[PDB]
Every structure is written in structure tokens, then in C-alpha cells.
Design an enzyme around this catalytic site. Structure first.
Site, PDB file in Angstrom:
ATOM      1  N   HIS A  67       0.725  -1.200   0.101  1.00  0.00           N
ATOM      2  CA  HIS A  67      -0.033  -0.022  -0.055  1.00  0.00           C
ATOM      3  C   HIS A  67       0.836   1.212   0.089  1.00  0.00           C
ATOM      4  O   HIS A  67       0.567   2.208   0.696  1.00  0.00           O
ATOM      5  CB  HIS A  67      -0.889  -0.074   1.241  1.00  0.00           C
ATOM      6  CG  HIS A  67      -2.180  -0.948   0.815  1.00  0.00           C
ATOM      7  ND1 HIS A  67      -2.215  -2.109   1.421  1.00  0.00           N
ATOM      8  CD2 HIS A  67      -3.186  -0.841  -0.222  1.00  0.00           C
ATOM      9  CE1 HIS A  67      -3.457  -2.635   1.164  1.00  0.00           C
ATOM     10  NE2 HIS A  67      -3.960  -1.819  -0.025  1.00  0.00           N
ATOM     11  N   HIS A  71       1.737   1.879  -5.703  1.00  0.00           N
ATOM     12  CA  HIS A  71       0.394   1.250  -5.749  1.00  0.00           C
ATOM     13  C   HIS A  71      -0.368   2.528  -6.196  1.00  0.00           C
ATOM     14  O   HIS A  71      -1.273   2.340  -7.179  1.00  0.00           O
ATOM     15  CB  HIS A  71      -0.112   0.764  -4.559  1.00  0.00           C
ATOM     16  CG  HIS A  71      -1.417   0.672  -4.446  1.00  0.00           C
ATOM     17  ND1 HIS A  71      -2.194  -0.461  -5.284  1.00  0.00           N
ATOM     18  CD2 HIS A  71      -2.787   1.151  -3.516  1.00  0.00           C
ATOM     19  CE1 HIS A  71      -3.488  -0.653  -4.772  1.00  0.00           C
ATOM     20  NE2 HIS A  71      -3.953   0.301  -4.039  1.00  0.00           N
ATOM     21  N   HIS A 105      -5.890   7.775  -3.006  1.00  0.00           N
ATOM     22  CA  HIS A 105      -6.686   6.846  -2.544  1.00  0.00           C
ATOM     23  C   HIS A 105      -6.365   5.945  -1.313  1.00  0.00           C
ATOM     24  O   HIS A 105      -7.114   5.561  -0.517  1.00  0.00           O
ATOM     25  CB  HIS A 105      -7.563   6.041  -3.619  1.00  0.00           C
ATOM     26  CG  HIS A 105      -6.618   4.842  -3.538  1.00  0.00           C
ATOM     27  ND1 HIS A 105      -5.746   4.885  -4.565  1.00  0.00           N
ATOM     28  CD2 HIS A 105      -6.749   3.593  -3.220  1.00  0.00           C
ATOM     29  CE1 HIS A 105      -5.136   3.545  -4.753  1.00  0.00           C
ATOM     30  NE2 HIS A 105      -5.772   2.684  -3.942  1.00  0.00           N
ATOM     31  N   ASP A 106      -4.966   5.806  -1.206  1.00  0.00           N
ATOM     32  CA  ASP A 106      -4.409   5.103   0.049  1.00  0.00           C
ATOM     33  C   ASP A 106      -3.520   6.002   0.591  1.00  0.00           C
ATOM     34  O   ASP A 106      -2.494   5.346   1.498  1.00  0.00           O
ATOM     35  CB  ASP A 106      -3.736   3.919  -0.340  1.00  0.00           C
ATOM     36  CG  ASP A 106      -4.923   2.580  -0.660  1.00  0.00           C
ATOM     37  OD1 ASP A 106      -5.927   2.558   0.096  1.00  0.00           O
ATOM     38  OD2 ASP A 106      -4.247   1.860  -1.353  1.00  0.00           O
ATOM     39  N   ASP A 216      -8.244  -0.281  -8.498  1.00  0.00           N
ATOM     40  CA  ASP A 216      -7.569  -0.729  -7.045  1.00  0.00           C
ATOM     41  C   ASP A 216      -7.006  -1.901  -7.254  1.00  0.00           C
ATOM     42  O   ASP A 216      -6.339  -2.432  -6.599  1.00  0.00           O
ATOM     43  CB  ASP A 216      -8.619  -0.597  -6.109  1.00  0.00           C
ATOM     44  CG  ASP A 216      -7.789  -0.380  -4.754  1.00  0.00           C
ATOM     45  OD1 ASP A 216      -6.547  -0.188  -4.885  1.00  0.00           O
ATOM     46  OD2 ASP A 216      -8.611  -0.219  -3.548  1.00  0.00           O
ATOM     47  N   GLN A 268      -6.057 -17.459  -3.858  1.00  0.00           N
ATOM     48  CA  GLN A 268      -6.238 -16.392  -4.847  1.00  0.00           C
ATOM     49  C   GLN A 268      -7.750 -16.941  -5.942  1.00  0.00           C
ATOM     50  O   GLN A 268      -8.360 -15.762  -6.210  1.00  0.00           O
ATOM     51  CB  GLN A 268      -5.027 -16.561  -6.012  1.00  0.00           C
ATOM     52  CG  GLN A 268      -3.706 -15.713  -5.147  1.00  0.00           C
ATOM     53  CD  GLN A 268      -4.049 -14.375  -4.966  1.00  0.00           C
ATOM     54  OE1 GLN A 268      -4.162 -13.654  -6.116  1.00  0.00           O
ATOM     55  NE2 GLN A 268      -4.250 -14.167  -3.837  1.00  0.00           N
TER      56      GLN A 268
HETATM   57  C1  LIG Z   1      -4.554 -10.516  -5.218  1.00  0.00           C
HETATM   58  C2  LIG Z   1      -5.339  -9.492  -4.613  1.00  0.00           C
HETATM   59  N1  LIG Z   1      -5.583  -8.132  -4.734  1.00  0.00           N
HETATM   60  C3  LIG Z   1      -6.625  -7.388  -3.849  1.00  0.00           C
HETATM   61  C4  LIG Z   1      -6.927  -7.877  -2.702  1.00  0.00           C
HETATM   62  C5  LIG Z   1      -7.850  -7.041  -1.695  1.00  0.00           C
HETATM   63  N2  LIG Z   1      -6.745  -9.361  -2.363  1.00  0.00           N
HETATM   64  N3  LIG Z   1      -7.262 -10.023  -1.529  1.00  0.00           N
HETATM   65  C6  LIG Z   1      -6.755 -11.384  -1.598  1.00  0.00           C
HETATM   66  C7  LIG Z   1      -7.093 -12.637  -0.894  1.00  0.00           C
HETATM   67  C8  LIG Z   1      -6.922 -13.889  -1.343  1.00  0.00           C
HETATM   68  C9  LIG Z   1      -6.969 -14.832  -0.221  1.00  0.00           C
HETATM   69  N4  LIG Z   1      -5.932 -15.770   0.281  1.00  0.00           N
HETATM   70  C10 LIG Z   1      -6.310 -16.594   1.064  1.00  0.00           C
HETATM   71  C11 LIG Z   1      -5.671 -17.604   1.751  1.00  0.00           C
HETATM   72  C12 LIG Z   1      -4.349 -17.780   1.697  1.00  0.00           C
HETATM   73  N5  LIG Z   1      -4.008 -19.062   2.352  1.00  0.00           N
HETATM   74  N6  LIG Z   1      -5.120 -19.423   2.625  1.00  0.00           N
HETATM   75  C13 LIG Z   1      -6.114 -18.768   2.329  1.00  0.00           C
HETATM   76  N7  LIG Z   1      -7.822 -16.323   1.416  1.00  0.00           N
HETATM   77  N8  LIG Z   1      -8.015 -15.295   0.519  1.00  0.00           N
HETATM   78  C14 LIG Z   1      -9.311 -14.567   0.398  1.00  0.00           C
HETATM   79  N9  LIG Z   1      -5.845 -11.456  -2.983  1.00  0.00           N
HETATM   80  C15 LIG Z   1      -6.046 -10.045  -3.237  1.00  0.00           C
HETATM   81 MG   LIG Z   2      -7.301   1.349   0.466  1.00  0.00          MG
HETATM   82 ZN   LIG Z   3      -5.639   0.677  -3.008  1.00  0.00          ZN
HETATM   83 ZN   LIG Z   4      -5.877  -2.085  -0.389  1.00  0.00          ZN
END
Ligand SMILES: Cc1ncc(C)n2nc(/C=C/c3nc(-c4cn[nH]c4)nn3C)nc12
Ligand SMILES: [Mg+2]
Ligand SMILES: [Zn+2]
Ligand SMILES: [Zn+2]
Length: 312
Positions: A67, A71, A105-106, A216, A268
Site C-alpha cells: 500500500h 500502488h 486513494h491510499d 484498485d 487466489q
Molecule cells: C490479489 C489480491 N488483490 C487485492 C486484494 C484485496 N486481495 N485479497 C486477496 C486474498 C486472497 C486470499 N488468500 C487466502 C488464503 C491464503 N492462504 N489460505 C487462504 N484467502 N483469500 C481470500 N488477494 C488479493
Molecule cells: Mg485502500
Molecule cells: Zn488501494
Molecule cells: Zn488495499
């Protein structure tokens, strides 16, 4: 006058959705100004004011893994691409406000989620009970705009000024992912019952909200090696937050637990399917020329599938 120009590879590639702004931090201000100049005009902003605004914004991003100031510029480039591919759909104020909104934005993000600040009981969580970081980001934006010689909007009228700050506020609040789900559902419904109407201010607002979520999240729309390397930075924050949750005596969600590194590919997948794909689908429905974001996102999902299958 003085037109910023970029080397040939960047001049050509910056127009594409999947452009990566590169590792040379010192070229990021020029890249941003180049974008403002082409999506808005060399007349939108007093160069000296704009330059000064940009450097203050930069100084108010922190050195966290994800962040950060890279970004900010990245999210603003995605917005530039959206705007350039939908030339005639946006007002002059919107073109102005949205790149600034994305750069801002961040602002002053600490690498921790809203939910962590609430559990920590951070002062910001008493000040802003929802969209905690995002109301802080907009607050920081106004602060910076009010520094001596930093008012890049000075040449608008009182009401144009208030409209642009209102565009920026809503755009920034919209980057709170908790708000995306319901926003996208509304948009989906309006689009499919044919009630979507871009002359209705509250519809535009929703659509600009969605564009904000799209910009974003745009790390998922890059070439695979960029997407995969960005994912490391993303998880480095998640896991640091995980550790901090454990410090407060709270089991973090799996996303944030570094002991569950193995489930990342599967996490993912869930994310592309629950958040990313839906987001770029609805965006492409509404704004057809942003389809390359959807296409890139799907390629990357397919790449995470290959990782799970041990082919990658
Ligand atoms: C690529 C990306 N860009 C923005 C944002 C807000 N995000 N948020 C994710 C989250 C993934 C995820 N990884 C696990 C997990 C890991 N190990 N076990 C489970 N759960 N989740 C839900 N990935 C992203
Ligand atoms: Mg944010
Ligand atoms: Zn952001
Ligand atoms: Zn974020």
C-alpha cells in the site's frame, strides 16, 4: 509550452491496460503528469502546483510492502487507461478528479486493514466507524490540497470546486472493498433491467465506484510475472497483519496467517471468482472497451489454476 514525453517503449505501452510503471521510482511523477496531460489537458493544472502536489502526496505514502506510492501510481494508470478508452463518457471535472482521486486513494496507509484498526482500537476507528482508512485517505487528501501553493483546483469556481472534492470523496470511499459487493450487485441489476442511466448522478456515482474497485484491484490484470510478484507484496502485508492479530490474542483469517502459505493458490482462486471476475465482468458490461481488463484477469485465474495443478 512544456509537454512531458516518455521514451518510445513507455509512450506506446502506457496506453495499454496491462502497463507496469517499472522499478525507477523517479520516473513515476513524470509518468503521472504525462497521464494528466493526455487524459485532461496541459491546461487542467498549473504545472508548478501539480508538481508540488504530487511530491507532497508521495511523501505521505509510507514505505510498506504493498500500500505504497508505487500502488498509487499504478491505480492511477489503470484509471488513465479506462478514461482514454471511454473518451466521450466523462465530464471535464471527472477526468480531473479521478486521477487525483486514484493517486490519493491510499494516502498514509499503514499496511493494516479496517478490521485490524477496530480490533486494535486505533484512534482512527473512533473517529471513523466505517470505511475507517478510506475516510482517513480523503482527510489526508484535503490536508495536502490546503497546503500553501498546493491547490491544483484553485482556478475552478466555488461550486465546481465542491463538485470535484465530492467526486474525489466518493471515489476514495468506494475503494473500501466492503462496499464493492453491494455496489456491484446494484449495478448488475440496473444494467440487466435496463434501468442503468448515466445522466442520473447517483448511477454515475455507482459506476465511478466500480471503476475505482477495478483500478484498485488491477494487479490481477497484469502480465502473469507482474501479477505473481505483486501477490508477494500483498501477502507480506496480510501476514504482518496476521502476526499483529496473534499479538492481540486473535486467530487471524487464513488470508493473513503465514502458517497457511500453502493455501495461497486456492485463496487466489476464491478471490478471482468472488471479487475480481465479477468486478471486471460488470465493468465490461457497462463500459465495453475495458474488456482487456476482464480478459487479462481471466488469464491470471487460469495461471493460478496451473499453479495448483503443479504445472507452474
Ligand atoms: C490479489 C489480491 N488483490 C487485492 C486484494 C484485496 N486481495 N485479497 C486477496 C486474498 C486472497 C486470499 N488468500 C487466502 C488464503 C491464503 N492462504 N489460505 C487462504 N484467502 N483469500 C481470500 N488477494 C488479493
Ligand atoms: Mg485502500
Ligand atoms: Zn488501494
Ligand atoms: Zn488495499
Amino acid at each position: 509550452l512544456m509537454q512531458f514525453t516518455l521514451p518510445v517503449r513507455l509512450c506506446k505501452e502506457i496506453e495499454l491496460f496491462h502497463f507496469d510503471i517499472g522499478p525507477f521510482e523517479n520516473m513515476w511523477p513524470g509518468i503521472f503528469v504525462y497521464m494528466v496531460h493526455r487524459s485532461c489537458g496541459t491546461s487542467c493544472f498549473e504545472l508548478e502546483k501539480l508538481c508540488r502536489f504530487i511530491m507532497s502526496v508521495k511523501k505521505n505514502y509510507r514505505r510498506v510492502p504493498y500500500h505504497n506510492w508505487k500502488h498509487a501510481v499504478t491505480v492511477a494508470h489503470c484509471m488513465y487507461a479506462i478514461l482514454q478508452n471511454n473518451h466521450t463518457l466523462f465530464t471535464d471535472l471527472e477526468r480531473k478528479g479521478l486521477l487525483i482521486a486514484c493517486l490519493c486513494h491510499d494516502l498514509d496507509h499503514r499496511g493494516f486493514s479496517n478490521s485490524y484498526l477496530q480490533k486494535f482500537d486505533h484512534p482512527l476507528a473512533a473517529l471513523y466507524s466505517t470505511s475507517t482508512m478510506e475516510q482517513h485517505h480523503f482527510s489526508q487528501t484535503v490536508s495536502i490540497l490546503q497546503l500553501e501553493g498546493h491547490n491544483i483546483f484553485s482556478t475552478l469556481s466555488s461550486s465546481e470546486y465542491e463538485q470535484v472534492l465530492e467526486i474525489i470523496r466518493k471515489a476514495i470511499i468506494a475503494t473500501d472493498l466492503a462496499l464493492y459487493f453491494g455496489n456491484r450487485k446494484q449495478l448488475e441489476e440496473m444494467y440487466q433491467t435496463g434501468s442503468l442511466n448515466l445522466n442520473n448522478q447517483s448511477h454515475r456515482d455507482r459506476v465511478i465506484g466500480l471503476m475505482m474497485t477495478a483500478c484498485d484491484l488491477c494487479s490481477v490484470t497484469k502480465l502473469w510475472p507482474v501479477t505473481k510478484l505483486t501477490a508477494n507484496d500483498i501477502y507480506a502485508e496480510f501476514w504482518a497483519e496476521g502476526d499483529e492479530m496473534k499479538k492481540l490474542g486473535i486467530q487471524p483469517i487464513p488470508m493473513m496467517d503465514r502458517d497457511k502459505k500453502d493455501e495461497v493458490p486456492q485463496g487466489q482462486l476464491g478471490f478471482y471468482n468472488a471479487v475480481a471476475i465479477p468486478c471486471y465482468t460488470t465493468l465490461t458490461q457497462i463500459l465495453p472497451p475495458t474488456e482487456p481488463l476482464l480478459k487479462a484477469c481471466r488469464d491470471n485465474l487460469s495461471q493460478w489454476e496451473k499453479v495448483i495443478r503443479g504445472e507452474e
